[PDB]
Coordinates of C-alpha atoms and ligand atoms in Angstrom, one line a residue:
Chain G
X1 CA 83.7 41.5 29.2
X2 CA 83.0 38.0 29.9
X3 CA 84.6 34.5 29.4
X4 CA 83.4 32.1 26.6
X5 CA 85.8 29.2 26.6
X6 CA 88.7 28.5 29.8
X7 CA 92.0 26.3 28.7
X8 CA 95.5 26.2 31.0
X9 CA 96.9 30.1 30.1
X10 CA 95.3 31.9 28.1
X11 CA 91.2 32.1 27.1
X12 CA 88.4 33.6 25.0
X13 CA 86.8 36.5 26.1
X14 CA 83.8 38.4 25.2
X15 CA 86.6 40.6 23.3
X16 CA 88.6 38.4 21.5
X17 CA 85.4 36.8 20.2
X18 CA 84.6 40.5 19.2
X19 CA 88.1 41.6 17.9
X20 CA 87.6 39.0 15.1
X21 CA 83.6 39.2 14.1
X22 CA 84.3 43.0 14.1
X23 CA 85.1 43.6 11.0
X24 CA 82.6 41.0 9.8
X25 CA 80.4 42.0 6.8
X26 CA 77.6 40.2 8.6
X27 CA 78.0 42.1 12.2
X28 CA 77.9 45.6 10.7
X29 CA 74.0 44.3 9.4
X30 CA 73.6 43.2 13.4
X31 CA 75.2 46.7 14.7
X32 CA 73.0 48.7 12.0
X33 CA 70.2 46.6 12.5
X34 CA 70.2 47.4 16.7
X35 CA 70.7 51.2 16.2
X36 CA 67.1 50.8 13.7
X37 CA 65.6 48.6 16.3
X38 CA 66.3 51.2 19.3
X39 CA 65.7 54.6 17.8
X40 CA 62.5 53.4 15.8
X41 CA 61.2 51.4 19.4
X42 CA 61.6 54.7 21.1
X43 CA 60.5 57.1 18.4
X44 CA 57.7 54.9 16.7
X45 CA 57.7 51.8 19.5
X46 CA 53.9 52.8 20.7
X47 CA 52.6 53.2 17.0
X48 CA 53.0 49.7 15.6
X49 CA 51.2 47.1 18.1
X50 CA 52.6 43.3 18.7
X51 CA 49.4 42.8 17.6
X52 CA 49.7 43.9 14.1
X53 CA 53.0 41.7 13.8
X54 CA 51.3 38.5 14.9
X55 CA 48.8 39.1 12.1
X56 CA 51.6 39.8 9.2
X57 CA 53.3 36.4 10.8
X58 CA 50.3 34.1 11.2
X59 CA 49.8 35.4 7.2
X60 CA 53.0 34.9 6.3
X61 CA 52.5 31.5 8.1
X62 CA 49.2 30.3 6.7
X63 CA 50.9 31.2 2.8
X64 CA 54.2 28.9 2.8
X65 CA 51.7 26.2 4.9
X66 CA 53.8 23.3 6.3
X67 CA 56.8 24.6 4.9
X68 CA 57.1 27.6 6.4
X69 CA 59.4 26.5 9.3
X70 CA 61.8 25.1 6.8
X71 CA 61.8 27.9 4.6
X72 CA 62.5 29.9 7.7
X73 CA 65.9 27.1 8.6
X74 CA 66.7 27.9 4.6
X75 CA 67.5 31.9 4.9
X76 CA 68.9 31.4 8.2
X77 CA 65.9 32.4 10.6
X78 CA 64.4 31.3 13.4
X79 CA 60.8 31.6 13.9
X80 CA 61.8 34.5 16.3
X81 CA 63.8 36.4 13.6
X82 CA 61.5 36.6 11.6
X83 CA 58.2 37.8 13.6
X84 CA 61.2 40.4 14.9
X85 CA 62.1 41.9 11.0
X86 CA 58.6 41.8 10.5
X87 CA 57.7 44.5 13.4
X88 CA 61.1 47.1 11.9
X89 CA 59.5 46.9 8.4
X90 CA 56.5 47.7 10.4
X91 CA 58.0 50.5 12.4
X92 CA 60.2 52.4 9.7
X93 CA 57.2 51.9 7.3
X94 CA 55.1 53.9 9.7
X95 CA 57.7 56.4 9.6
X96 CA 58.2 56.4 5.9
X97 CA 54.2 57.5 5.8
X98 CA 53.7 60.1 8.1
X99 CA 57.0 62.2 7.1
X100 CA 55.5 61.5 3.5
X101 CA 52.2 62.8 4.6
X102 CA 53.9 66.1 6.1
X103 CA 56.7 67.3 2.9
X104 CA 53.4 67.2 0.5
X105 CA 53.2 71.1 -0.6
X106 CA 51.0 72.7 -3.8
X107 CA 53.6 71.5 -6.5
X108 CA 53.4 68.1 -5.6
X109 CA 49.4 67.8 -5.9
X110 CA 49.6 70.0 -9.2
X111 CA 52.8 67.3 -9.9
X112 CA 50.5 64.4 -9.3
X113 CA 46.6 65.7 -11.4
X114 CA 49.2 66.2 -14.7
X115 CA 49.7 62.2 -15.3
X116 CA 46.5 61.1 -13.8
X117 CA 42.8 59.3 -15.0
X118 CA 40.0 58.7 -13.5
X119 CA 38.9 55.9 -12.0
X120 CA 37.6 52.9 -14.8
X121 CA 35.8 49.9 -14.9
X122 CA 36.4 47.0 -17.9
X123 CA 35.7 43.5 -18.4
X124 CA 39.8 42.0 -18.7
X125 CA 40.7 39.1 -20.6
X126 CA 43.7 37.6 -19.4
X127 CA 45.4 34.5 -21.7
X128 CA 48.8 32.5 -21.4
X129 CA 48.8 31.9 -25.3
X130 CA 49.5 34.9 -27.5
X131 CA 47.5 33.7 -30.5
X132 CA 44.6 32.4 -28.7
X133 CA 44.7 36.1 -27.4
X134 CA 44.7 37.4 -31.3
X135 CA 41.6 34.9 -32.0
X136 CA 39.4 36.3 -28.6
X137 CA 40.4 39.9 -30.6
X138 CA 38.3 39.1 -33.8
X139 CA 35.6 37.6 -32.0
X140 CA 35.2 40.6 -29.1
X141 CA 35.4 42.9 -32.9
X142 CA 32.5 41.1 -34.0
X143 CA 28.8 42.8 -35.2
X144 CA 27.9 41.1 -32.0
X145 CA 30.3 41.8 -29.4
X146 CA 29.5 40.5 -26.7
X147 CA 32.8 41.1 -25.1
X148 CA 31.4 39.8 -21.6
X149 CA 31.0 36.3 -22.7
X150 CA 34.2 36.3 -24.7
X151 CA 35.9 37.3 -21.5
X152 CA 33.8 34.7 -19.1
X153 CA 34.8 31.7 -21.7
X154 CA 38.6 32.2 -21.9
X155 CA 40.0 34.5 -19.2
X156 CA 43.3 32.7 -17.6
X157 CA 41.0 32.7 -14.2
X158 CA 40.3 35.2 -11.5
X159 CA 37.5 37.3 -12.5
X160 CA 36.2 39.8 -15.7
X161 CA 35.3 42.9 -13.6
X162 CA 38.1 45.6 -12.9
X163 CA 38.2 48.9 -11.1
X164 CA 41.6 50.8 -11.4
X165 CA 43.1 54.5 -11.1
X166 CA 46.5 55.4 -13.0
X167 CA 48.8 55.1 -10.2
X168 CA 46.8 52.1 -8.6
X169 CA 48.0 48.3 -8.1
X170 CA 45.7 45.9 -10.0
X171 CA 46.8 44.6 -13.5
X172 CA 50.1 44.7 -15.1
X173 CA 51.4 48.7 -15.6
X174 CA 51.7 47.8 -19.5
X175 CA 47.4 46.8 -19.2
X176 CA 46.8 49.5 -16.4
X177 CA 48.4 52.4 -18.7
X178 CA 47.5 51.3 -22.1
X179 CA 44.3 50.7 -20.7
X180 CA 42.8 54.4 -19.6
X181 CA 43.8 55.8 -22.9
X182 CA 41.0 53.8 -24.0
X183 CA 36.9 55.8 -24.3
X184 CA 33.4 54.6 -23.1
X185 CA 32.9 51.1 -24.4
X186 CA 36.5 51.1 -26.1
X187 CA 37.9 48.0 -27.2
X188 CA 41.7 47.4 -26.5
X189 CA 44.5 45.7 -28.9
X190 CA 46.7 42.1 -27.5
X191 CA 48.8 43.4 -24.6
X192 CA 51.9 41.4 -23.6
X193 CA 52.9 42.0 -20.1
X194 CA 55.2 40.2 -17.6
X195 CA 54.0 37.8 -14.4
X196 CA 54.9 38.1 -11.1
X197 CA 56.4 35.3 -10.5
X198 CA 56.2 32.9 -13.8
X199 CA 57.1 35.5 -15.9
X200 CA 55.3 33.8 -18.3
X201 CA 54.3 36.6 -21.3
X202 CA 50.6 36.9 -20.3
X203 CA 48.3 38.6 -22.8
X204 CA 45.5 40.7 -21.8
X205 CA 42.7 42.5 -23.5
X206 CA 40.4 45.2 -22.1
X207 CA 37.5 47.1 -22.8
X208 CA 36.3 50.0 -20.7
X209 CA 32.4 49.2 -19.5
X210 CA 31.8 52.7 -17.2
X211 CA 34.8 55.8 -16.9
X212 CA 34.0 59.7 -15.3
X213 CA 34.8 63.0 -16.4
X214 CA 38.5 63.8 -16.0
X215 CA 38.0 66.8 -13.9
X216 CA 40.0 69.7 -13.5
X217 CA 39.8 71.0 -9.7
X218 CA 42.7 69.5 -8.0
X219 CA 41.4 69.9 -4.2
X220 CA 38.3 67.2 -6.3
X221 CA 40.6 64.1 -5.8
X222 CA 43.4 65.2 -3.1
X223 CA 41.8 61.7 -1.7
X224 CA 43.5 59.6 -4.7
X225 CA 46.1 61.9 -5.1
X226 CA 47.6 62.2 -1.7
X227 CA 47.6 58.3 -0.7
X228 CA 49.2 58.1 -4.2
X229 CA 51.8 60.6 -3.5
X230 CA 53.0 58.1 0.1
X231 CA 52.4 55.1 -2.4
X232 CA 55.8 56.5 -4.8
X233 CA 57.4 58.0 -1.3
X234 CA 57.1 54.6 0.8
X235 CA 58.3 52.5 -2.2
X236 CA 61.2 55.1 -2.8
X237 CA 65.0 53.7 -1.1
X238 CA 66.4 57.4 -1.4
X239 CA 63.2 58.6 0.6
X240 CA 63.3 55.6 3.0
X241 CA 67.3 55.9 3.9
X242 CA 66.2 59.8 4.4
X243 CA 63.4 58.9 7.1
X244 CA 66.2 56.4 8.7
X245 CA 68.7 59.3 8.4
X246 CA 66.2 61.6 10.5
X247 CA 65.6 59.7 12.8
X248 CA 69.0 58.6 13.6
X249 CA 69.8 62.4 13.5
X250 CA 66.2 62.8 16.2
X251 CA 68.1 60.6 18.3
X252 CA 71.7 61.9 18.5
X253 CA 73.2 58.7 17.0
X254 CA 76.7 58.5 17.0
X255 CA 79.0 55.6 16.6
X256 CA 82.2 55.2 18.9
X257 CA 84.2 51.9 17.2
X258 CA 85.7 52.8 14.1
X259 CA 85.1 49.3 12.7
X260 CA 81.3 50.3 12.4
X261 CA 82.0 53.9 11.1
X262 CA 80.8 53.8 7.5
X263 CA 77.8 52.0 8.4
X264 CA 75.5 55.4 8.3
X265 CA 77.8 56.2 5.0
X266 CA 73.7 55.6 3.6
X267 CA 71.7 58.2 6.6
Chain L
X1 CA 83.0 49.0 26.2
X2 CA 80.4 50.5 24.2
X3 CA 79.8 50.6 20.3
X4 CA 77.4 53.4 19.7
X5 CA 75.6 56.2 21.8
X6 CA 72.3 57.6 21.2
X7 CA 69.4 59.9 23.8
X8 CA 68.6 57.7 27.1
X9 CA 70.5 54.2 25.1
X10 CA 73.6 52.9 24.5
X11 CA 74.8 49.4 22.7
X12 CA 77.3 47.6 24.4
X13 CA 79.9 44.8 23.0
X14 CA 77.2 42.6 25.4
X15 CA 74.6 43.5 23.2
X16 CA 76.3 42.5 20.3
X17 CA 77.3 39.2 21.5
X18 CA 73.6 38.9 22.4
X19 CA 73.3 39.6 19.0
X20 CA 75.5 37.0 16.9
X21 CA 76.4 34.5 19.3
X22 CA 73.8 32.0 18.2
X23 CA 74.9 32.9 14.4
X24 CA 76.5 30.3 12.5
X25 CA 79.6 32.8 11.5
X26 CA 79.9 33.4 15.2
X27 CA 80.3 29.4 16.0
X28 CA 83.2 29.3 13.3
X29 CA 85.3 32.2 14.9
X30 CA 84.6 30.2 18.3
X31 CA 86.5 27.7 16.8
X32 CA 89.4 29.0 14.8
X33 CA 90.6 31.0 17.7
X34 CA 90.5 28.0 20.0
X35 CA 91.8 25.8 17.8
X36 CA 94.5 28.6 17.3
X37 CA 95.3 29.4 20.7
X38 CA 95.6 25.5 21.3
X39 CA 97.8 24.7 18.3
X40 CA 99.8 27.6 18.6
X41 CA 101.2 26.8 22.5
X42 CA 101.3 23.1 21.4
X43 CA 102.9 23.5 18.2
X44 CA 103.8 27.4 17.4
X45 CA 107.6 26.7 17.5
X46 CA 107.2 23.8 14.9
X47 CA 105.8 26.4 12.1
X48 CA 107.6 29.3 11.6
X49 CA 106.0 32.8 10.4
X50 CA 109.2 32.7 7.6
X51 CA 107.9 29.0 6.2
X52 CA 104.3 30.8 6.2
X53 CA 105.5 33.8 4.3
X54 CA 106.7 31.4 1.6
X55 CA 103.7 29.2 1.0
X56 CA 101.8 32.6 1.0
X57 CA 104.0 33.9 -1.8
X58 CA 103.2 30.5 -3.6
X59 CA 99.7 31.9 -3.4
X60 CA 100.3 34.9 -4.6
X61 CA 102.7 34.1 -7.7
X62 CA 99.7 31.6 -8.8
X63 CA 97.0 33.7 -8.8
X64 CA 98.9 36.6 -9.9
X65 CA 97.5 40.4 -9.7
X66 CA 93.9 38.9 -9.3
X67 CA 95.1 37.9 -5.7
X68 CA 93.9 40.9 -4.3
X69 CA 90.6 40.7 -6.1
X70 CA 90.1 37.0 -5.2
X71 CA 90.7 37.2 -1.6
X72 CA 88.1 39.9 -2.1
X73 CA 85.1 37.8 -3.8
X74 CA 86.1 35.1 -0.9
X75 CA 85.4 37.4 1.6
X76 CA 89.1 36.8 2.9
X77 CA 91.5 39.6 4.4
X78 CA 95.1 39.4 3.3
X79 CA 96.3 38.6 6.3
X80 CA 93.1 36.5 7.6
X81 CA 94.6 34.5 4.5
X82 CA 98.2 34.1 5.7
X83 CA 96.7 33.7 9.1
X84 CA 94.3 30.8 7.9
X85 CA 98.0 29.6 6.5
X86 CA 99.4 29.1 9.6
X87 CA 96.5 27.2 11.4
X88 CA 96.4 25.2 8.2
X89 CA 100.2 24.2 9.0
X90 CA 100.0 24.4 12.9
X91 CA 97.3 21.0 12.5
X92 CA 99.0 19.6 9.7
X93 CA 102.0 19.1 11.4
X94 CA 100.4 17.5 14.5
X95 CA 98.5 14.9 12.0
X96 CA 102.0 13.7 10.5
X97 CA 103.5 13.8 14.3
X98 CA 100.4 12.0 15.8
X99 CA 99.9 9.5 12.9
X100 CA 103.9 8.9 13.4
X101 CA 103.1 7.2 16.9
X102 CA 100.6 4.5 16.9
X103 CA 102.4 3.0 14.0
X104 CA 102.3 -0.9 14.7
X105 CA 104.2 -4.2 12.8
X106 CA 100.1 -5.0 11.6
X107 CA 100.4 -1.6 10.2
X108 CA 103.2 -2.4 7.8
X109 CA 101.6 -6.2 7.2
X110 CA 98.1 -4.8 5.7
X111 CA 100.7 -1.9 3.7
X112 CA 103.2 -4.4 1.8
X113 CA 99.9 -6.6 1.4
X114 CA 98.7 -4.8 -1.7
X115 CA 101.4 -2.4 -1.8
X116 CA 103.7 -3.8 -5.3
X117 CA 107.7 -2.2 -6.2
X118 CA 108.4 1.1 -7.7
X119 CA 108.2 1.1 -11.4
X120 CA 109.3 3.7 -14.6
X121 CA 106.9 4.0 -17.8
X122 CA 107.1 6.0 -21.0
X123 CA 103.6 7.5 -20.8
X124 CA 101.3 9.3 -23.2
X125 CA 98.9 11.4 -22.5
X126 CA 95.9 12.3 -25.1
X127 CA 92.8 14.6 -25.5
X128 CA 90.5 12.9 -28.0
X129 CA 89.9 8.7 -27.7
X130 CA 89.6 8.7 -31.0
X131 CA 93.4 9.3 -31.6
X132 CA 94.5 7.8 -28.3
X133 CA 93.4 4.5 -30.4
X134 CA 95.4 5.4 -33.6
X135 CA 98.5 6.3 -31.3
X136 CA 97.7 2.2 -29.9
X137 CA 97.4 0.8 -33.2
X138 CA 100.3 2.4 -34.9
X139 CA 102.6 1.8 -31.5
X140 CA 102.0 -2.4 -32.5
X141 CA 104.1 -2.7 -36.1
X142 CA 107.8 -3.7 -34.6
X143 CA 107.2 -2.9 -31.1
X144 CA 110.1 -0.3 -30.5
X145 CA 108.1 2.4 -32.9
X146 CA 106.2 3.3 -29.3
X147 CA 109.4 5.2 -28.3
X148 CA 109.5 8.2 -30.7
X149 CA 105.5 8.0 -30.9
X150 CA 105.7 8.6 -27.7
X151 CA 107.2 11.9 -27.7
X152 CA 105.7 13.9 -30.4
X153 CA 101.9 12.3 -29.1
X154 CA 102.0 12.9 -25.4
X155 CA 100.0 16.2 -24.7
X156 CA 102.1 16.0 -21.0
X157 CA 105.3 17.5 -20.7
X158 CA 107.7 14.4 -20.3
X159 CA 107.0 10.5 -20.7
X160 CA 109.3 9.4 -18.5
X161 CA 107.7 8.6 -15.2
X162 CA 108.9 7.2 -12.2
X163 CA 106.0 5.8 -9.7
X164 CA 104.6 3.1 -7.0
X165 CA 100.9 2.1 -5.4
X166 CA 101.4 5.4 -3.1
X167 CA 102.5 8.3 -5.5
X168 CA 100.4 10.7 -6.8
X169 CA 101.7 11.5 -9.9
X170 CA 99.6 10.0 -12.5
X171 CA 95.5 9.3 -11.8
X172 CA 94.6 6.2 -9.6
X173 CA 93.1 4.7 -12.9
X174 CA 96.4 5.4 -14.9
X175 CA 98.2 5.1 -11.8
X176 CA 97.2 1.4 -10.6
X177 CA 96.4 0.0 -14.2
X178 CA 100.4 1.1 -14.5
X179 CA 101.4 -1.5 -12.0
X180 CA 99.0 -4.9 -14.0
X181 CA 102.1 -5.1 -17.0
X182 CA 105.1 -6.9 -16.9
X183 CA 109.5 -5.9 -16.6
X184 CA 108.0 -4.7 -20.5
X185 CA 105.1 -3.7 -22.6
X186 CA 102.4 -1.5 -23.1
X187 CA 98.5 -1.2 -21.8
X188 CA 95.3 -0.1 -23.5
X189 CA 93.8 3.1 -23.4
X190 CA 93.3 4.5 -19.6
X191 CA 90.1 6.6 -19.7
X192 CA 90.9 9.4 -16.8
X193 CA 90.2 12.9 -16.1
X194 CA 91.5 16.4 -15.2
X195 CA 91.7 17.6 -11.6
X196 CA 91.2 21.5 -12.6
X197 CA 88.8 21.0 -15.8
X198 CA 86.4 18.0 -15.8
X199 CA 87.7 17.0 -19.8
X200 CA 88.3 13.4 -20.3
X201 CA 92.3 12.8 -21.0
X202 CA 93.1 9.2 -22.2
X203 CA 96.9 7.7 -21.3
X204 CA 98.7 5.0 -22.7
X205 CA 101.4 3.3 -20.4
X206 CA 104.5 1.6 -21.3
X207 CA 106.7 -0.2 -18.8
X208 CA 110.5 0.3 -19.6
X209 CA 111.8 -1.1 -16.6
X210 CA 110.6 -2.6 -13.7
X211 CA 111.3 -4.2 -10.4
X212 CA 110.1 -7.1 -7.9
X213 CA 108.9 -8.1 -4.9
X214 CA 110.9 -8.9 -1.9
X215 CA 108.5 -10.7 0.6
X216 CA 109.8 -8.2 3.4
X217 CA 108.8 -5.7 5.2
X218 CA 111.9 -3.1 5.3
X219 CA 112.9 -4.0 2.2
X220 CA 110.0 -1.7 1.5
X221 CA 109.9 0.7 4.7
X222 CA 110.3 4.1 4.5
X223 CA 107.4 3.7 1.8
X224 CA 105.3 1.8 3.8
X225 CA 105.9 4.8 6.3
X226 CA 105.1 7.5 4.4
X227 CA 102.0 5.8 2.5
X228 CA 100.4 5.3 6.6
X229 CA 100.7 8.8 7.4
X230 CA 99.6 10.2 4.0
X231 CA 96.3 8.0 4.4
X232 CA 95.7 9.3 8.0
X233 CA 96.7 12.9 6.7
X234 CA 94.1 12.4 4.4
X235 CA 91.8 10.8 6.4
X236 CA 88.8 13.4 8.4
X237 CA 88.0 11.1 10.9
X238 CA 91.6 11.1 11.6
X239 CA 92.3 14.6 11.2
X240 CA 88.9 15.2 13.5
X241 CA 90.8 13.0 16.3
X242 CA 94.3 15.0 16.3
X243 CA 92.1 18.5 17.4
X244 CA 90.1 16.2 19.6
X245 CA 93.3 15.0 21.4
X246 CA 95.0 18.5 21.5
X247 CA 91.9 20.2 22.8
X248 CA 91.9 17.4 25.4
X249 CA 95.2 18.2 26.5
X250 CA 94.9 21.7 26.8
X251 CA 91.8 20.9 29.0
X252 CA 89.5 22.8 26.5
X253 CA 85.7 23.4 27.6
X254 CA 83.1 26.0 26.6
X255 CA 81.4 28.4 29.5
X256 CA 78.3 29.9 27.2
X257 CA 75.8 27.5 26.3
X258 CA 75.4 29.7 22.7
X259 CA 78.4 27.5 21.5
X260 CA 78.1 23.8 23.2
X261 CA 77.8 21.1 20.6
X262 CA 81.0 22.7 18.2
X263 CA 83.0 19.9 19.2
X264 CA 80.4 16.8 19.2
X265 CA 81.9 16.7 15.3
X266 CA 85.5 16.3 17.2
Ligands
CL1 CL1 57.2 63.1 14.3
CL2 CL1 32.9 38.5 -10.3
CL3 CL1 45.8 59.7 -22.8
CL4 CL1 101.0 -10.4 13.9
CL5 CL1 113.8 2.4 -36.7
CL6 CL1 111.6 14.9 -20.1

C-alpha cells in the first residue's frame, strides 16, 4: 500500500512488511482483536460509556500505585493499551449479561432453587496457623462460648460479621459451602481452604448467628436466583465465545486472507 | 487490499499496520528484510542456496526427528529456519571480507606479541577432582608411566592434541595453561567446564613436543591472519559496524516514523 523503508532497487512496502507478520501468531490476536473491537463498538459501542473505563483505569491505577506504569512497560502495554482492553472486556461483558438475561427459561430457575440456601449471617474466624485454629475450637466449645470474643481476639484481620448466599462471592467456597449446612447458632469444625494469592492454607471457623426459612416458592427469590444464573453464564468461556460467535454472525463477519481463516475456528 | 468484511466496515492491510507497527515483533521483521534485501544484492552470489541446504541438513541430522517439534516450540517455520540460514551466512561472509581489509603491520605487532608457537600434548580429561589428583600422583613414579595412564583415564576421545593461543579446541583455561610448560612435562590439574552441561571437567596436560619462537612476523602469518578476523567475527561492535557500512552503501533510510531508532544500535 505504502512505502516504509527506500534503498537503490528494490524497497519495503506496506506488503512485504505484511507478507511476513502474516502468519505471525501474534497478528492473528491483533486481526481477532479488531473484528471484536468493530462489531462490539457498533453493536454495544453506546452501552458502555468512556466514562466507565476511566473509572476501572484510575482503579486499576490507584492499586499497583507508582508501579503501575512499569508494570504496564513489563506485559508489553502502553498506558493506551491498556485503558483500550479495558473498554472490550467492558463491551463483550455487557453482551455476555443481557443474552444471559434473555436464554433464562422455567428449567433453569427450577435448576438453580435445587442447590441453593438462604441467605446467613456468622461471626468467621480466619487463622494462618492450623493448630492455633484447633485451640480457638475448644475454647468457642466451651460452657461459655462466647464465640464473638474468640473471633475478635484472633481473626487473621478484616472483620467477624458475614452475610453470604450459596452461589455468592465472600469467603472461600470450602467455608461458604460447608458453612450453610450448619443450624441456628451452629458451631463449625477447622476448615482449610486456599488464598487468593499466598496460597497460604488458611483455616477458618464459623458459626451461624441469624439464617431464614428455606422457602419453597421459586418466583420468592427469582432476585438471587436470576443475577446468580448471569454470575455462572458471564464466568462461562463456552458461553462467552457463543455471545462473540453471535455477534460476529449479527454482523456478517467474514474473513477474506486465508492466513487469518482459522481465527473464528472458536465463534 | 482488505483482510475481513463485515455490515457498513471493513479492515484493511492499513489498519493492520496501524495495528502492529509500533509492536516490538513488527520492528524485528523491519529489520530482517532490510538487512536481507541489502545482503542479498551485496552479497547473494557469495552464499549459495546449495551451501545453505547443507548446513540446514547439519541441523536436522543433530536434532534428529524432534526437528520438526523444536522448530515448533521456537516458534520457527522450516523454511523461516533455512531462511534465517542464509542471512546468518549472507553477514557472516561480509564480516570475514570486511575484517580482511583494514588489516595493518600494527595489527600483526599487537598479534605475535602474546601470540606463542603451535604445540602437541597428550591430554586427559576427568569428571571427579578427586581422581584427576590420583591420575597426577600416580603419573610422577618414572615419569613415562603418564603415557598409558593417559589412555585408559582420559574420559575424551583421543589425547593427542595439536593446538596454539588461537585454536579452540580445548578450554581457554586448559587451553592457555597448555602453552606455560616446557619442549616436556606435565601441569596440574586444570579446573574447567562443559559448554552444553555446566559439570566441572578437570584436564591434565602433557607437552610431548613443542616448538619456538621466531621473533618474526610471517614466520607466524597466516595465523596471525586468521586469529584478527576470528576476533572481529566475534566481536558485536564489529559485527554491528559491517551492517552499518552495508546499509550505508545501499543508501538505506526509514520513511514511517513507527520504526526510526532500529539502527541507532548500528
Ligand atoms: Cl440485542
Ligand atoms: Cl465490623
Ligand atoms: Cl445441606
Ligand atoms: Cl610501527
Ligand atoms: Cl614400563
Ligand atoms: Cl586417537
Amino acid at each position: 500500500n505504502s512505502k516504509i523503508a527506500t534503498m537503490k532497487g528494490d524497497t519495503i512496502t506496506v506488503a512485504d512488511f505484511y507478507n511476513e507478520v502474516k502468519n505471525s501468531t501474534a497478528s492473528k490476536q491483533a486481526v481477532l482483536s479488531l473484528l471484536v473491537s468493530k462489531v462490539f463498538e457498533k453493536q454495544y459501542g453506546d452501552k458502555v460509556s468512556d466514562k466507565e473505563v476511566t473509572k476501572a483505569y484510575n482503579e486499576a491505577a490507584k492499586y499497583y500505585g507508582d508501579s503501575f506504569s512499569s508494570a504496564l512497560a513489563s506485559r508489553g502495554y502502553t498506558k493506551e493499551d491498556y485503558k483500550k482492553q479495558i473498554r472490550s472486556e467492558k463491551l463483550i461483558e455487557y453482551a455476555v449479561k443481557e443474552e444471559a438475561k434473555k436464554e433464562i427459561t422455567d428449567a433453569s430457575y427450577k435448576s438453580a432453587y435445587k442447590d441453593y440456601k438462604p441467605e446467613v449471617t456468622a461471626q468467621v474466624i480466619q487463622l494462618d496457623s492450623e493448630d492455633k485454629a484447633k485451640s480457638v475450637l475448644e475454647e468457642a466449645k466451651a460452657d461459655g462460648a462466647d464465640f464473638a470474643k474468640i473471633a475478635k481476639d484472633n481473626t487473621k484481620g478484616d472483620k467477624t460479621e458475614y452475610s453470604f448466599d450459596s452461589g455468592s462471592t465472600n469467603l472461600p467456597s470450602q467455608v461458604l459451602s460447608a458453612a450453610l449446612n450448619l443450624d441456628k447458632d451452629g458451631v463449625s469444625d477447622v476448615i482449610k481452604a486456599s488464598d487468593s494469592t499466598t496460597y497460604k492454607p488458611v483455616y477458618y471457623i464459623v458459626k451461624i448467628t441469624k439464617k431464614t426459612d428455606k422457602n419453597a416458592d421459586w418466583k420468592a427469590y427469582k432476585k438471587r436466583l436470576k443475577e446468580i444464573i448471569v454470575s455462572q453464564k458471564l464466568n462461562d468461556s463456552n458461553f462467552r465465545n457463543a455471545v462473540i460467535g453471535k455477534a460476529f454472525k449479527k454482523a456478517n463477519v467474514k474473513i477474506k486472507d486465508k492466513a487469518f481463516s482459522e481465527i473464528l475456528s472458536q465463534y
